[PDB]
Amino acid sequence: DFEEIPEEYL
Amino acid sequence: EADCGLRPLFEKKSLEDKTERELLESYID
Amino acid sequence: IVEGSDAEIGMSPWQVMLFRKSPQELLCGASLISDRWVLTAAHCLLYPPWDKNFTENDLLVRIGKHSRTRYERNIEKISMLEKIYIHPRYNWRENLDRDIALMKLKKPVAFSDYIHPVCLPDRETAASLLQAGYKGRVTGWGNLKETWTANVGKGQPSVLQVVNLPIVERPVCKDSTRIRITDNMFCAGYKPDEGKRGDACEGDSGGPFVMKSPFNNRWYQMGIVSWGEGCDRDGKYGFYTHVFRLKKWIQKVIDQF
Numbered sequence: 497d498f499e500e501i502p503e504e505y506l
Numbered sequence: 507e508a509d510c511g512l513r514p515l516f517e518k519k520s521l522e523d524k525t526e527r528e529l530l531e532s533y534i535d
Numbered sequence: 536i537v538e539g540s541d542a543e544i545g546m547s548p549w550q551v552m553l554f555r556k557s558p559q560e561l562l563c564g565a566s567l568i569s570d571r572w573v574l575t576a577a578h579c580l581l582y583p584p585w586d587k588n589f590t591e592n593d594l595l596v597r598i599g600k601h602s603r604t605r606y607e608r609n610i611e612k613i614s615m616l617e618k619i620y621i622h623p624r625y626n627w628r629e630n631l632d633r634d635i636a637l638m639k640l641k642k643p644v645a646f647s648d649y650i651h652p653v654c655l656p657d658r659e660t661a662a663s664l665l666q667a668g669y670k671g672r673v674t675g676w677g678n679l680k681e682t683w684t685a686n687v688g689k690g691q692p693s694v695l696q697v698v699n700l701p702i703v704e705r706p707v708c709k710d711s712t713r714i715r716i717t718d719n720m721f722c723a724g725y726k727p728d729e730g731k732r733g734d735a736c737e738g739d740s741g742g743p744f745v746m747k748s749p750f751n752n753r754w755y756q757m758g759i760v761s762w763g764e765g766c767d768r769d770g771k772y773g774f775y776t777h778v779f780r781l782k783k784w785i786q787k788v789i790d791q792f
């Protein structure tokens with residue numbers, strides 16, 4: 497695999 | 507009330523998808 | 536999806552992806568029934584036998600996706616859960632009866648060319664569309680094969696996969712499993728003498744089983760990817776949650792008024 501999503505969600 | 511089931515790039519654009527007819531014909535057998 | 540195809544862009548705008556924060560991984564499929572509610576299968580959030588028990592804080596919801604792995608900045612929308620609701624009589628011990636679950640988003644989502652809700656059936660619709668022999672459509676990002684040679688390929692598809700399966704006569708379903716099937720289930724798939732294949736598979740769970748109404752030109756979600764015995768086996772079929780039967784519960788949970 498997955499491209500990275502914004503860390504605010506993680 | 508809320509509209510649904512109508513795909514913005516298909517139904518609404520008067521276009522149908524590649525295998526949609528298989529669904530449809532399955533009715534009129 | 537086994538023996539399916541790449542879906543066209545914007546082909547299932549109600550298709551939702553259930554993402555896991557850490558580790559980051561694809562949990563299941565799901566659908567958008569509205570501006571703030573998502574409908575998935577219970578067994579995607581809770582399956583004790585495997586110590587599976589997710590909560591509102593462990594997941595994410597990704598709507599408007601096409602590609603399985605990409606972060607589609609311009610088209611997709613990432614939402615956080617406000618509350619999860621599992622059918623009180625969901626039977627995870629024996630047959631997964633009432634395998635349904637609703638999820639309430641924290642903030643409403645904005646509809647688009649890529650994000651649109653699917654409809655829920657009414658008595659007449661369910662009555663005339665759910666008839667054996669009639670075809671339905673299943674979509675997901677799950678395994679392409681029940682099994683495969685490790686490291687030599689990729690069991691998962693690059694983009695959303697779509698397959699069209701016919702509904703099977705109850706008796707026929709009943710005869711295919713040792714499992715106790717209820718009136719809350721339904722089965723679909725081709726028969727061995729049918730000359731065609733296809734099935735949902737691991738990762739497709741929670742996904743929607745939809746149908747198209749010729750008269751009103753609208754899509755209706757008749758079932759939910761539930762369970763099965765492996766993927767694409769002959770003389771075996773997929774079992775979907777009967778959405779129509781469980782509508783009152785949905786209705787009760789949602790409370791639009």
Ligand SMILES: C[C@@H]1CNc2c(cccc2S(=O)(=O)N[C@@H](CCCNC(N)=[NH2+])C(=O)N2CC[C@@H](C)C[C@@H]2C(=O)O)C1
Pocket residue numbers: 578582629630631714734735736737738740760761762763764765766772773774
């Ligand atoms: C009453 C079901 C029957 N079978 C199973 C159960 C539990 C775990 C695994 C199996 S399975 O490996 O046979 N098949 C998977 C996947 C089948 C996919 N094929 C299809 N849908 N046509 C299953 O049903 N599952 C449902 C429960 C969940 C925990 C595991 C697994 C899923 O991931 O799909 C109980």
